[PDB]
């Protein structure tokens, strides 16, 4: 209703209804024919390559849809059965159906996973202008690739989709199907590259979540979904997940083994899964940097000598 | 234990000198044993094993070091059981966790790295003694172990074998750091500074610690696969102290190896070569005839651009296992790449004497020279040279000192001036008027009476310079400060002089200095080249020297080539850009024209000859660049001779006698040796100060006094008003303001340049009166104006009214 | 005692390291602190876990 207008997210309490229907010519009052909407969606997905395109903020359709589905889950769980528009109508499920369907297209999924790659260069808000830089900066800055949106999408898929599993199963089944496409030339290597990039994103999610959540001294099978789904990914992609996890382990140990690691202040492990997930939100709610605009029990006496002990600031040993 | 002396001394205390003597007598074995010691010292650091320890101070005296060792050597065996940090640049500040007893790991790692560097330097010295060993044994030690060329070869191989592990570790770390810094720079320039996550934009406890740690892990995981294109790498340099120590030591080893190896109309003619400050580290200069002046020398485009803390990169234009760049940020990849390259390369004396020993660093790479490495880790070095300068840079044989900016050179120069000043108890006293004509004549006459009654072949070292004005009987250094500027302004004026022949008793009235090209900066005007004029010029040089000795500024805005003459060094083509930028570019185009297929036709059509027309300020008329130059045509082949003689003639020949006199005048006060460490930029900052009035620099040194009795908040609002007005002033107006406040338009190049500090006194409200300044004490008085507009108008009028009142 | 104790401990640590390299440490306690070994202790548990899992695979 306010597309192209000056709109800003308000900072007041979220407990409010929407005034648009009363104060303006609200164009979202009419649901239309849902079956026709879905049929048209399918037709467009198979008829055009539009599924691969980003929006005006550089966001891939899958990122848009995953955030939308999680958000609708939050809003729609508050719905209750029973000149003014008809109220108390059943919420839409189109975003969830669209997310499930788009994830079944290898092109959409490839474009999203490879999004931020040197080949799949994001034209907007993603250091897309390089030619004006001197060669040194071109060589260095063109070498890296972005994963912020892949990381945020994977994070949403695992951590925020707390009422679903079919989405993750769809993604993994697609990756497996293409990895098993031995009869198609070139496609095999492409499937592997896509899978490896995805696995690295998942491994980042996994490490963050697992580090934050405190291990229970009591043996429990709770296995919170944020970590259990990461394990599920690795299990579905085991032969590749192992190698990628080995590389992650290498990157984690080198800072310690070589005496490189940064000093850091201590922090407490989160007892609940909720607080761990919230802590990760502050790490995954990130936007890419836009381009420049155009213009201790006591030791025995025989070994006490070996211990410097009596038996926030950063420190190397903490890190 | 023993602290390294920052002053170079040959004290070499016996406790250490005797150890060195032992190693020298047993060199072939001492080297191997010292390598094993170095291994034991580095392993605790390199493997992350070393114990945390509390810090301790190094002992300044040998006595206290020896006593500390007594507590370590006065030990009995256990008996058996009885029978029954300068601030980083904004583009790299993000990489430093800093504000720019308990034990700690980093303390121990750093001190262990210090011990390691000591041992490495000893090993490098012992290897350095091999070529002269057959001479340095008999002249130093009664007896020593004999060694041969073959043994020297094996020693080099053994030492490097023991050092390679540490070398590979260091290189992995350094390459990752350099990659992250260069990446941050490229991202900062490519990105939008308005964004809150931008490095230049940036430049709770439990949750902050957790967030930082998790972000660090995230960055590490991303960098491993080059998936870090839109975020700054997580990095902290404060943790790299120990590796910095190790790095200096390892460069020292390779540098010693390289030392052992070392121990026309062409553009190759010395005049066209890039000069002091212009040649970047292991960089290959961009050809000055291919890059326009505006881009080739940004400092020449903006002569006031020079700052005491300016980056060399900005002023002079932005620029094998080492030839391959450090592009990876992941550490692991860097070590693996090092190992791959290294594995490719890895897979009486008989015959020659030791004096023929030809050692080198030919492993890890085929040939290494330290300039290559200073170029590779250029950014890491620049950042270390500010963060670790006080710690790692204080080490003997420090390599950070080569990154020292103006302040380092100024520190050494000030020490020399203090040494020279304190040797004489005879001061200088000048009584002068404020009128320009009287000022010049009186100053020069009294300087000749002072100089000539002292030995004219010895420097005029004095304790204090005191000046008094006629009918204005102020006294001491403050008046001397106002006087230096008054006399400088008298020199730089376009008004006609009084007869300078009056100075000989101790008409060529052409102004002393003129503005060549389109700059407001000056070159001496030769006038009629009479002895009286050259006498005045020599006394001007004396003024410059005296101001330097007294730690005072002399605001005579001379061009760079003039300064080079004063410093006793050669002037080059690149300095002609500072004489006349327009002519520099036009002659550059003439050189480019000489490379065209029609160059002959162009040079003939221009009717060029080796003779130049001079403007009135240059003495006028036509003067030959070379004898018979009028009849000698300029050709595409002698274009370099023509440009060279044109530039040299206008920079030196036209004013050769004035320049010679000024050079002697500077030498009449200060010894030549004190000038050897300075470039034209350093001499400029010491003599002329900051031509650009950096308002923040003036703010940080200013203190405020209140005579109004008003509340602090109102006074703060007024202070903000004043500084905002100053920021909006044009450069001319800013210079007029600083001149009004201190009687000198230039700012001192450092905090130590102010003696005493400048201050502003806020007077009770008055919207009619103008501000006034007691410049002899650098104190400005400003009424507490009711509005910002009144302050602006009154301040501008006061500073532009050079007819200062006698306050 | 602070400064001198820190200096003495550090120098004794260096002395012990140099002695241990050549087994020349027969009459003095090695200089050692376990509080610094926390990170290696974590790594050690993990590495034993790897090998123990391998042995479990052999027995399973």
Three-state secondary-structure class, residue B456: coil
* Cα pseudo-dihedral B392, B393, B395, B398, rounded to 10: 120
Cα B101 to Cα B83: distance, rounded to the nearest angstrom: 43
Three-state secondary-structure class, residue B717: helix
* Residue entry with tokens 């806020």: B762
Cross-chain residue pair A134–B103, CB shorter than 8 Å: no
Is A312 at the interface with chain B, CB within 8 A? yes
Taken as a whole, chain B contains a residue count of 807
Cα A52 to Cα A55: distance, rounded to the nearest angstrom: 10
Cα B112 to Cα B40: distance, rounded to the nearest angstrom: 10
DSSP designation for B364: S
The DSSP annotation for chain A comes to: --TTS------S-S-----HHHHS--TTS----HHHHHHHHHHHHHH-SGGG-B-TTS-BHHHHHHHHHHHHHHHHTT-----PPP-SPPPP-HHHHHHHHHTT-HHHHHHHHTTTSSSS---SSSS---TTS-HHHHHHHHH----HHHHHHHHIIIII-TT-SHHHHHHHHHHHHHHT-TTSTTHHHHHHHHHHHHHHHHHHHHHHHHHHBPPPSS------HHHHHHHHHHHHTHHHHHHHHHHHHHHHHHHHHTT-PPPB---PPBSSHHHHHHHHHHHH---PPPBPPP--PPPPHHHHTT--S-----BTTT-
Which residues, at least 6 apart from B623, have a Cβ–Cβ distance to it below 8 Å? Answer: B611, B612, B614, B649, B653, B654
Cα dist from A154 to A66, A161, A183, whole Å: 9, 10, 29
* Of residues B776, B769, B777, B774, the one with CA closest to residue B797: B769
The DSSP annotation for B595-607 comes to: TSTTHHHHHHHTT
* Of residues A155, A240, A228, A227, the one with CA closest to residue A195: A240
* The 3-state secondary structure of B747-797, one letter per residue: ECCCHHHCCCCCEEEEECCCCCCCCEEEHHHCEEEEECCCCHHHHHHHHHH
- Is A230 labeled as ligand-binding? no
Residue A237 Cα, gap to closest chain C Cα (Å): 20
* Burial classification of residue B32, based on how many CB atoms lie within 10 Å of its CB (0-12 exposed, 13-18 middle, 19 or more buried): middle
* Residue entry with tokens 């595409």: B636
Contact (CB, 8 A) for B627 and B603: no
Cα dist from B650 to A105, B25, B266, B592, B791, whole Å: 75, 62, 21, 21, 45
* Residue entry with tokens 């306050």: B807
Three-state secondary-structure class, residue B522: strand
Instruction: For residue B776, indicate whether it is catalytic.
Output: yes
Three-state secondary-structure class, residue B467: strand
Please give the structure tokens belonging to residue B300: 């020449």
| Most C-contacting residue of A317, A318, A319 (CB-CB within 10 A), to test interface | A317
Please give the structure tokens belonging to residue A189: 């290597």
Is C34 at the interface with chain A, CB within 8 A? yes
Which residues, at least 6 apart from B626, have a Cβ–Cβ distance to it below 8 Å? Answer: B610, B632, B645
Cα B512 to Cα B515: distance, rounded to the nearest angstrom: 11
Helix axes of B205-223 and A187-212: crossing angle, nearest 10 degrees: 160
Which residues, at least 6 apart from C43, have a Cβ–Cβ distance to it below 8 Å? Answer: A253, A256
* Cα pseudo-dihedral B287, B292, B297, B300, rounded to 10: 140
Radius of gyration of chain B (CA): 32
Taken in order B574, B579, B580, B583, is the CA torsion positive or negative?
negative
CA angle B54, B56, B57 (to 5 degrees): 165
Cα dist from B12 to B19, B24, B472, whole Å: 11, 15, 57
Contact (CB, 8 A) for B651 and B575: yes
Distance of CA B372 to the CA centre of its chain: 21
Please give the structure tokens belonging to residue A232: 């599920």
Q: Is A34 left (phi over 0), alpha (psi -120 to 50) or beta?
A: alpha
Query: Count of CB atoms within 10 A of residue B216's CB?
Result: 19
Cα B53 to Cα B625: distance, rounded to the nearest angstrom: 71
* Residue C39 with chain A: CB contacts under 8 Å: 256, 317
Cα B576 to Cα B783: distance, rounded to the nearest angstrom: 47
Cα A45 to Cα A37: distance, rounded to the nearest angstrom: 12
* Residue B242 with chain A: CB contacts under 8 Å: 259
Residue of C nearest to B75 (CA): C28
Helix axes of A94-102 and A166-179: crossing angle, nearest 10 degrees: 20
Cross-chain residue pair B72–C11, CB shorter than 8 Å: yes
Taken in order B540, B546, B549, B554, is the CA torsion positive or negative?
negative
Core vs surface per residue B379-388: b (16+ CB within 10 A) or e? bbbbbbbbbb
Is A121 at the interface with chain B, CB within 8 A? no
For residue A103, how many C-alpha atoms fall within 13 Å in the half-sphere facing its CB?
23
Cα B479 to Cα B550: distance, rounded to the nearest angstrom: 13
Query: Count of CB atoms within 10 A of residue B552's CB?
Result: 21
Taken in order B528, B529, B535, B541, is the CA torsion positive or negative?
positive
- Is A77 labeled as ligand-binding? no
* Of residues B475, B488, B474, B597, the one with CA closest to residue B553: B488
In B323-458 the beta strands, taken as DSSP E runs, fall at 428-432
* Residue C17 with chain B: CB contacts under 8 Å: 40-41, 44
Identify the helix (H) or strand (E) that includes residue B544: helix B531-549
Please give the structure tokens belonging to residue A64: 């848009």
Is C3 at the interface with chain A, CB within 8 A? no
DSSP designation for B651: I
Which residues, at least 6 apart from B591, have a Cβ–Cβ distance to it below 8 Å? Answer: B289, B639, B640, B643
Residue C32 Cα, gap to closest chain B Cα (Å): 7
Helix axes of A135-143 and B149-190: crossing angle, nearest 10 degrees: 90
Q: At residue B796, what are phi and psi to the nearest 5 degrees?
A: -60, -45
Residue A309 Cα, gap to closest chain C Cα (Å): 7
Radius of gyration of chain A (CA): 24
* Residue B112 with chain C: CB contacts under 8 Å: 14
Which chains are within 8 Å of B by 3+ CB pairs? A, C
Q: At residue B139, what are phi and psi to the nearest 5 degrees?
A: -85, -5
* Burial classification of residue A82, based on how many CB atoms lie within 10 Å of its CB (0-12 exposed, 13-18 middle, 19 or more buried): exposed
- Is A5 labeled as ligand-binding? yes
Q: How was this structure determined?
A: cryo-EM
* Of residues B407, B436, B246, B477, the one with CA closest to residue B752: B407
Q: Are strands B779-783 and B759-763 parallel, antiparallel or unpaired?
A: parallel
Which chains are within 8 Å of A by 3+ CB pairs? B, C
Query: Count of CB atoms within 10 A of residue B70's CB?
Result: 8
The DSSP annotation for B122-191 comes to: HHHHHHHHSTTHHHHTTTT-S------HHHHHHHHHHHHHHHHHHHHHHHHHHHHHHHHHHHHHHHHHHB
* Residue entry with tokens 């010395």: B270
For residue A137, how many C-alpha atoms fall within 13 Å in the half-sphere facing its CB?
17
* Residue C21 with chain B: CB contacts under 8 Å: 36-37, 39-40
* Of residues A257, A248, A95, A82, the one with CA closest to residue A164: A95
Cross-chain residue pair B318–A251, CB shorter than 8 Å: no
Cα B225 to Cα B120: distance, rounded to the nearest angstrom: 36
Is A256 at the interface with chain C, CB within 8 A? yes
Contact (CB, 8 A) for B299 and B315: yes
* Of residues B424, C34, B173, the one with CA closest to residue A299: C34
Cα dist from A30 to A25, A27, A85, A94, whole Å: 12, 7, 9, 14
């Amino acid at each position: 209703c306010h597309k192209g207008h000056d709109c800003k997210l308000k900072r007041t309490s979220p407990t409010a209804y929407c005034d648009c229907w009363e104060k303006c010519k609200c164009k979202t009052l009419i649901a239309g024919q849902k079956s026709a909407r879905l049929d048209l969606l399918y037709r467009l997905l198979t008829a055009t390559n539009l599924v691969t395109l980003p929006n005006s903020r550089g966001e891939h359709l899958l990122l848009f849809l995953v955030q939308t589905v999680a958000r609708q889950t939050v809003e729609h769980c508050q719905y209750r059965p029973p000149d003014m528009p008809d109220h108390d109508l059943e919420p839409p499920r189109f975003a969830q159906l669209a997310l499930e369907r788009v994830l079944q297209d290898w092109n959409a999924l490839k474009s999203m996973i490879m999004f931020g790659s040197q080949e799949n260069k994001d034209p907007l808000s993603a250091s897309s202008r390089i030619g004006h830089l001197l060669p040194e900066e071109q060589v260095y800055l063109n070498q890296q690739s972005g994963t912020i949106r892949l990381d945020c999408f994977t994070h949403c898929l695992i951590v925020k989709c707390t009422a679903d599993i079919l989405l993750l199963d769809t993604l993994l089944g697609t990756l497996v199907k293409e990895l098993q496409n031995k009869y198609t030339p070139g496609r095999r290597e492409e499937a592997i590259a896509v899978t490896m990039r995805f696995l690295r994103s998942v491994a980042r999610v996994f490490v963050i979540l697992s580090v934050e959540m405190a291990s229970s001294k009591k043996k429990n099978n709770f296995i919170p979904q944020p970590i259990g789904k990461c394990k599920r990914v690795f299990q579905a992609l085991l032969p590749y997940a192992v190698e990628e996890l080995c590389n992650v382990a290498e990157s984690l140990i080198v800072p310690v083994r070589m005496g490189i690691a940064r000093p850091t202040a201590p922090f407490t492990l989160a007892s609940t899964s909720i607080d761990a997930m919230q802590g990760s939100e502050e790490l995954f709610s990130v936007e890419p940097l836009p381009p420049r605009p155009s213009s201790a029990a006591q030791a025995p006496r025989s070994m006490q000598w070996a211990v410097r002990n009596t038996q926030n600031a950063s420190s190397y040993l903490t890190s | 234990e023993m602290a390294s002396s920052k002053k170079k001394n040959n004290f070499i205390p016996q406790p250490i000198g005797k150890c060195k003597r032992v190693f020298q007598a047993l060199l072939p074995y001492a080297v191997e044993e010292l390598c094993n010691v170095a291994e034991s010292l580095i392993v605790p650091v390199r493997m992350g094993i070393a114990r945390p320890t509390a810090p301790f101070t190094l002992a300044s005296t040998s006595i206290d070091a020896m006593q500390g060792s007594e507590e370590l050597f006065s030990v009995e065996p256990l008996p058996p059981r009885p029978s029954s940090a300068a601030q980083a640049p904004r583009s790299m500040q993000w990489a430093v966790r800093n504000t720019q007893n308990a034990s700690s790991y980093l303390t121990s790692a750093s001190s262990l790295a210090r011990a390691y560097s000591i041992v490495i330097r000893q090993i490098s010295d012992l290897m350095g003694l091999i070529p002269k060993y057959n001479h340095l044994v008999y002249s130093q030690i009664p007896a020593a172990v004999k060694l041969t060329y073959q043994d020297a070869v094996n020693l080099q191989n053994y030492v490097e074998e023991k050092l390679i592990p540490t070398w590979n570790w260091m290189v992995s770390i350094m390459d990752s750091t350099e990659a992250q810094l260069r990446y941050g720079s490229a991202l900062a320039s490519a990105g939008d500074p308005g964004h809150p996550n931008h490095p230049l934009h940036a430049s709770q406890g439990m949750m902050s610690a957790r967030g930082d740690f998790l972000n660090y892990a995230l960055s590490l995981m991303r960098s491993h696969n080059d998936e870090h294109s839109d975020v700054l790498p997580v990095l902290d340099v404060c943790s790299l102290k120990h590796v910095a120590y190790v790095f200096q030591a390892l460069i020292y080893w390779i540098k010693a190896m390289n030392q052992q190896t070392t121990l026309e109309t062409g553009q190759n003619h010395p005049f066209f070569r890039r000069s002091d400050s212009m040649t970047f580290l292991g960089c290959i200069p961009p050809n000055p005839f291919e890059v326009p002046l505006a881009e080739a020398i940004p400092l020449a485009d903006q002569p006031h651009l020079l700052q005491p803390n300016a980056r060399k990169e900005d002023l002079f234009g932005r620029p094998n296992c080492l030839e391959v760049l450090p592009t990876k940020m992941s550490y692991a990849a860097n070590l693996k790449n090092v190992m791959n390259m290294q594995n490719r390369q890895k897979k009486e004396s008989e015959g020659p004497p030791l004096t023929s020993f030809r050692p080198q660093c030919s492993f890890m790479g085929m040939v290494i020279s330290h300039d290559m490495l200073l170029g590779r880790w250029r950014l890491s070095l620049e950042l270390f040279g500010r963060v670790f300068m006080e710690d790692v840079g204080a080490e003997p044989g420090s390599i950070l000192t080569e990154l020292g900016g103006f302040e380092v050179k100024e520190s050494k120069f000030r020490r020399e001036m203090e040494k020279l000043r304190n040797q004489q108890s005879r001061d200088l006293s000048l009584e002068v008027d404020r009128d320009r004509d009287l000022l010049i004549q009186q100053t020069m006459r009294q300087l000749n009476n002072h100089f000539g009654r002292r030995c004219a072949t010895t420097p005029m070292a004095v304790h204090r310079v005191k000046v008094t004005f006629k009918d204005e009987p102020g006294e001491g250094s403050g008046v001397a400060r106002s006087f230096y500027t008054a006399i400088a302004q008298a020199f730089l004026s376009n008004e006609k002089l009084p007869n300078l022949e009056c100075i000989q008793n101790a008409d060529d009235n052409a102004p002393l200095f003129y503005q060549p090209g389109k700059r407001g900066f000056y070159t001496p005007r030769p006038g009629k080249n009479t002895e009286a004029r050259l006498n005045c010029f020599r006394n001007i040089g004396r003024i410059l020297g005296l101001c330097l000795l007294q730690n005072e500024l002399c605001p005579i805005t001379l061009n760079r080539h003039v300064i080079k003459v004063l410093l006793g060094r050669k002037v080059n083509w690149h300095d002609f850009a500072f004489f006349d930028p327009v002519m520099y570019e036009s002659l550059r185009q003439l050189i480019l024209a000489s490379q065209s297929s029609d160059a002959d036709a162009v040079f003939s059509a221009m009717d060029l000859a080796f003779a130049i027309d001079l403007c009135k300020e240059e003495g006028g008329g036509q003067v030959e660049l070379i004898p018979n130059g009028v009849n000698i045509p300029v050709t595409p082949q002698n274009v370099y001779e023509y440009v060279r003689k044109y530039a040299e003639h206008r920079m030196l020949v036209v004013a050769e006698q004035p320049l010679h006199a000024m050079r002697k005048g500077l030498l009449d006060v200060l010894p030549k040796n004190s000038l050897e460490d300075l470039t034209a930029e350093d001499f400029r900052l010491l003599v002329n100060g900051c031509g650009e009035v950096n308002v923040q620099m003036l703010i940080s040194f200013t203190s405020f006094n209140d005579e109004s009795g008003e509340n602090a908040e109102k006074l703060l609002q007024f202070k903000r008003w004043f500084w905002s007005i100053v920021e909006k002033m044009s450069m001319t107006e800013r210079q007029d303001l600083v001149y009004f406040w201190t009687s000198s338009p230039s700012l001192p190049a450092s905090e130590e340049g102010f003696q005493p500090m400048p201050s502003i006194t806020i007077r009770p409200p008055d919207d009619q009166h103008l501000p006034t300044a007691n410049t002899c004490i650098s104190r400005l008085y400003v009424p507490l104006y009711s509005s910002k507009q009144i302050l602006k108008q009154k301040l501008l009028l006061a500073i532009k009214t050079k007819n200062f009142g006698f306050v």
